[PDB]
Amino acid sequence: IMLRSTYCLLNGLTDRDLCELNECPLDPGGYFIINGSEKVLIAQEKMAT
DNA sequence: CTAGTTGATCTCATATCAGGAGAAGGAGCAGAGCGAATAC
RNA sequence: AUCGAGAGGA
DNA sequence: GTATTCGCTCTGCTCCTTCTCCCATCCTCTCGATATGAGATCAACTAG
């Protein structure tokens, strides 16, 4: 699950609620946690179809 | 001499796209050149 | 430790 | 008996195809993946 996505537990949480889960409110999300490692998918250019 | 004990070692057996450049080969055509082969 | 990958530095 | 061809070979010439090679130096870091014993043989004992 990508963090801060709709299906993330951090979805819709207030800055209170994030801090109260030990999360940074300024953290944008948009990445995955695989084996504890934060992984970000890079958009890949391709020639339109 | 001469049999019995001790280790090592081997076999065998048990289941279940937006590269490029150059060198080497083969291909097909083109002709040259010489043997034979009709033929005047 | 090896391999690969990635991100960087000059 | 010499023209004249003429079939056949011998290169040889472009060209297209294949294939094989190469693509700066050095340095740092992180991160993920990556059996067991029985029997036989032989050789050293280990003594008789």
Short mmCIF file of all heavy atoms in Angstrom, two decimals, chain C:
data_model
loop_
_atom_site.label_atom_id
_atom_site.label_comp_id
_atom_site.label_asym_id
_atom_site.label_seq_id
_atom_site.Cartn_x
_atom_site.Cartn_y
_atom_site.Cartn_z
P A C 1 32.93 -7.73 3.23
OP1 A C 1 34.25 -7.51 2.59
OP2 A C 1 31.71 -7.18 2.57
"O5'" A C 1 32.68 -9.28 3.48
"C5'" A C 1 33.75 -10.22 3.45
"C4'" A C 1 33.51 -11.29 2.41
"O4'" A C 1 32.41 -12.14 2.84
"C3'" A C 1 33.10 -10.80 1.03
"O3'" A C 1 34.23 -10.47 0.23
"C2'" A C 1 32.30 -11.97 0.48
"O2'" A C 1 33.15 -12.96 -0.08
"C1'" A C 1 31.64 -12.53 1.73
N9 A C 1 30.26 -12.03 1.94
C8 A C 1 29.90 -11.07 2.85
N7 A C 1 28.62 -10.82 2.88
C5 A C 1 28.10 -11.67 1.93
C6 A C 1 26.79 -11.88 1.49
N6 A C 1 25.74 -11.21 1.97
N1 A C 1 26.58 -12.80 0.54
C2 A C 1 27.63 -13.48 0.06
N3 A C 1 28.92 -13.37 0.39
C4 A C 1 29.09 -12.44 1.35
P U C 2 34.05 -9.80 -1.22
OP1 U C 2 35.36 -9.87 -1.91
OP2 U C 2 33.38 -8.49 -1.06
"O5'" U C 2 33.06 -10.77 -2.00
"C5'" U C 2 33.52 -11.66 -3.00
"C4'" U C 2 32.38 -12.30 -3.74
"O4'" U C 2 31.32 -12.64 -2.81
"C3'" U C 2 31.69 -11.43 -4.77
"O3'" U C 2 32.39 -11.36 -5.99
"C2'" U C 2 30.32 -12.08 -4.88
"O2'" U C 2 30.37 -13.24 -5.70
"C1'" U C 2 30.06 -12.50 -3.44
N1 U C 2 29.24 -11.55 -2.67
C2 U C 2 27.87 -11.58 -2.80
O2 U C 2 27.30 -12.33 -3.56
N3 U C 2 27.20 -10.68 -2.01
C4 U C 2 27.74 -9.78 -1.11
O4 U C 2 27.01 -9.03 -0.47
C5 U C 2 29.16 -9.82 -1.03
C6 U C 2 29.83 -10.67 -1.79
P C C 3 32.20 -10.09 -6.96
OP1 C C 3 33.08 -10.26 -8.14
OP2 C C 3 32.31 -8.86 -6.13
"O5'" C C 3 30.69 -10.21 -7.45
"C5'" C C 3 30.28 -11.30 -8.27
"C4'" C C 3 28.79 -11.30 -8.46
"O4'" C C 3 28.13 -11.48 -7.18
"C3'" C C 3 28.19 -10.01 -8.99
"O3'" C C 3 28.35 -9.85 -10.39
"C2'" C C 3 26.75 -10.13 -8.55
"O2'" C C 3 26.01 -11.01 -9.38
"C1'" C C 3 26.91 -10.77 -7.18
N1 C C 3 26.93 -9.79 -6.07
C2 C C 3 25.71 -9.35 -5.55
O2 C C 3 24.67 -9.80 -6.06
N3 C C 3 25.70 -8.47 -4.53
C4 C C 3 26.85 -8.02 -4.03
N4 C C 3 26.80 -7.15 -3.02
C5 C C 3 28.10 -8.45 -4.54
C6 C C 3 28.09 -9.32 -5.55
P G C 4 28.51 -8.38 -11.01
OP1 G C 4 28.84 -8.53 -12.45
OP2 G C 4 29.42 -7.60 -10.13
"O5'" G C 4 27.05 -7.76 -10.90
"C5'" G C 4 26.00 -8.28 -11.69
"C4'" G C 4 24.64 -7.93 -11.12
"O4'" G C 4 24.57 -8.31 -9.72
"C3'" G C 4 24.28 -6.46 -11.11
"O3'" G C 4 23.86 -5.98 -12.38
"C2'" G C 4 23.20 -6.41 -10.05
"O2'" G C 4 21.96 -6.90 -10.54
"C1'" G C 4 23.75 -7.40 -9.03
N9 G C 4 24.56 -6.71 -8.00
C8 G C 4 25.92 -6.65 -7.89
N7 G C 4 26.33 -5.96 -6.87
C5 G C 4 25.16 -5.53 -6.27
C6 G C 4 24.96 -4.75 -5.12
O6 G C 4 25.81 -4.25 -4.38
N1 G C 4 23.62 -4.55 -4.87
C2 G C 4 22.59 -5.05 -5.62
N2 G C 4 21.36 -4.76 -5.23
N3 G C 4 22.76 -5.78 -6.69
C4 G C 4 24.06 -5.98 -6.96
P A C 5 24.14 -4.46 -12.79
OP1 A C 5 23.87 -4.31 -14.24
OP2 A C 5 25.46 -4.05 -12.25
"O5'" A C 5 23.03 -3.65 -12.00
"C5'" A C 5 21.66 -4.02 -12.09
"C4'" A C 5 20.85 -3.42 -10.98
"O4'" A C 5 21.29 -3.95 -9.70
"C3'" A C 5 20.97 -1.92 -10.80
"O3'" A C 5 20.22 -1.19 -11.75
"C2'" A C 5 20.52 -1.74 -9.36
"O2'" A C 5 19.11 -1.84 -9.25
"C1'" A C 5 21.14 -2.96 -8.70
N9 A C 5 22.47 -2.66 -8.14
C8 A C 5 23.69 -2.98 -8.67
N7 A C 5 24.70 -2.60 -7.93
C5 A C 5 24.09 -1.98 -6.85
C6 A C 5 24.62 -1.36 -5.71
N6 A C 5 25.92 -1.26 -5.47
N1 A C 5 23.74 -0.85 -4.83
C2 A C 5 22.44 -0.95 -5.08
N3 A C 5 21.83 -1.51 -6.11
C4 A C 5 22.72 -2.01 -6.97
P G C 6 20.81 0.17 -12.36
OP1 G C 6 20.02 0.52 -13.55
OP2 G C 6 22.28 0.07 -12.47
"O5'" G C 6 20.48 1.24 -11.24
"C5'" G C 6 19.15 1.40 -10.78
"C4'" G C 6 19.11 2.01 -9.41
"O4'" G C 6 19.82 1.18 -8.47
"C3'" G C 6 19.80 3.35 -9.28
"O3'" G C 6 19.03 4.41 -9.81
"C2'" G C 6 20.03 3.43 -7.78
"O2'" G C 6 18.83 3.70 -7.08
"C1'" G C 6 20.43 1.99 -7.48
N9 G C 6 21.89 1.80 -7.53
C8 G C 6 22.64 1.24 -8.52
N7 G C 6 23.91 1.21 -8.25
C5 G C 6 23.99 1.80 -7.00
C6 G C 6 25.11 2.06 -6.18
O6 G C 6 26.29 1.81 -6.40
N1 G C 6 24.73 2.67 -5.00
C2 G C 6 23.45 2.99 -4.65
N2 G C 6 23.27 3.57 -3.47
N3 G C 6 22.41 2.76 -5.40
C4 G C 6 22.75 2.17 -6.55
P A C 7 19.76 5.68 -10.46
OP1 A C 7 18.79 6.34 -11.36
OP2 A C 7 21.08 5.29 -10.99
"O5'" A C 7 20.01 6.63 -9.23
"C5'" A C 7 19.09 6.72 -8.15
"C4'" A C 7 19.76 7.22 -6.91
"O4'" A C 7 20.62 6.20 -6.34
"C3'" A C 7 20.68 8.39 -7.12
"O3'" A C 7 19.97 9.61 -7.22
"C2'" A C 7 21.61 8.31 -5.91
"O2'" A C 7 21.01 8.86 -4.75
"C1'" A C 7 21.74 6.80 -5.73
N9 A C 7 22.96 6.25 -6.36
C8 A C 7 23.05 5.68 -7.60
N7 A C 7 24.25 5.28 -7.90
C5 A C 7 24.99 5.60 -6.78
C6 A C 7 26.34 5.42 -6.48
N6 A C 7 27.21 4.85 -7.31
N1 A C 7 26.77 5.84 -5.29
C2 A C 7 25.91 6.41 -4.46
N3 A C 7 24.61 6.64 -4.62
C4 A C 7 24.21 6.20 -5.82
P G C 8 20.66 10.88 -7.89
OP1 G C 8 19.64 11.95 -7.99
OP2 G C 8 21.40 10.45 -9.10
"O5'" G C 8 21.72 11.31 -6.79
"C5'" G C 8 23.01 11.74 -7.16
"C4'" G C 8 23.96 11.63 -6.01
"O4'" G C 8 24.26 10.24 -5.74
"C3'" G C 8 25.31 12.26 -6.26
"O3'" G C 8 25.30 13.66 -6.07
"C2'" G C 8 26.21 11.49 -5.31
"O2'" G C 8 26.05 11.95 -3.97
"C1'" G C 8 25.62 10.09 -5.42
N9 G C 8 26.26 9.32 -6.50
C8 G C 8 25.71 8.87 -7.67
N7 G C 8 26.57 8.23 -8.41
C5 G C 8 27.75 8.26 -7.69
C6 G C 8 29.04 7.74 -7.97
O6 G C 8 29.43 7.11 -8.95
N1 G C 8 29.93 8.03 -6.96
C2 G C 8 29.64 8.73 -5.82
N2 G C 8 30.62 8.91 -4.94
N3 G C 8 28.45 9.20 -5.54
C4 G C 8 27.57 8.94 -6.52
P G C 9 26.08 14.61 -7.09
OP1 G C 9 25.60 16.00 -6.90
OP2 G C 9 26.04 14.02 -8.44
"O5'" G C 9 27.57 14.53 -6.58
"C5'" G C 9 27.90 14.78 -5.22
"C4'" G C 9 29.35 14.49 -4.98
"O4'" G C 9 29.58 13.07 -5.05
"C3'" G C 9 30.29 15.07 -6.01
"O3'" G C 9 30.55 16.44 -5.80
"C2'" G C 9 31.50 14.16 -5.90
"O2'" G C 9 32.29 14.50 -4.77
"C1'" G C 9 30.83 12.82 -5.64
N9 G C 9 30.63 12.03 -6.87
C8 G C 9 29.48 11.71 -7.54
N7 G C 9 29.69 10.95 -8.57
C5 G C 9 31.06 10.74 -8.57
C6 G C 9 31.89 10.00 -9.44
O6 G C 9 31.58 9.34 -10.43
N1 G C 9 33.22 10.07 -9.06
C2 G C 9 33.68 10.77 -7.98
N2 G C 9 34.99 10.73 -7.75
N3 G C 9 32.93 11.46 -7.17
C4 G C 9 31.64 11.39 -7.53
P A C 10 30.51 17.47 -7.02
OP1 A C 10 30.16 18.80 -6.48
OP2 A C 10 29.70 16.94 -8.13
"O5'" A C 10 32.02 17.53 -7.50
"C5'" A C 10 33.10 17.22 -6.63
"C4'" A C 10 34.33 16.85 -7.41
"O4'" A C 10 34.45 15.42 -7.51
"C3'" A C 10 34.39 17.32 -8.85
"O3'" A C 10 34.72 18.69 -8.98
"C2'" A C 10 35.41 16.38 -9.45
"O2'" A C 10 36.73 16.78 -9.13
"C1'" A C 10 35.09 15.08 -8.72
N9 A C 10 34.18 14.25 -9.53
C8 A C 10 32.83 14.32 -9.65
N7 A C 10 32.34 13.44 -10.49
C5 A C 10 33.46 12.78 -10.96
C6 A C 10 33.64 11.73 -11.88
N6 A C 10 32.65 11.13 -12.53
N1 A C 10 34.90 11.31 -12.11
C2 A C 10 35.90 11.90 -11.46
N3 A C 10 35.86 12.89 -10.58
C4 A C 10 34.60 13.28 -10.38
#
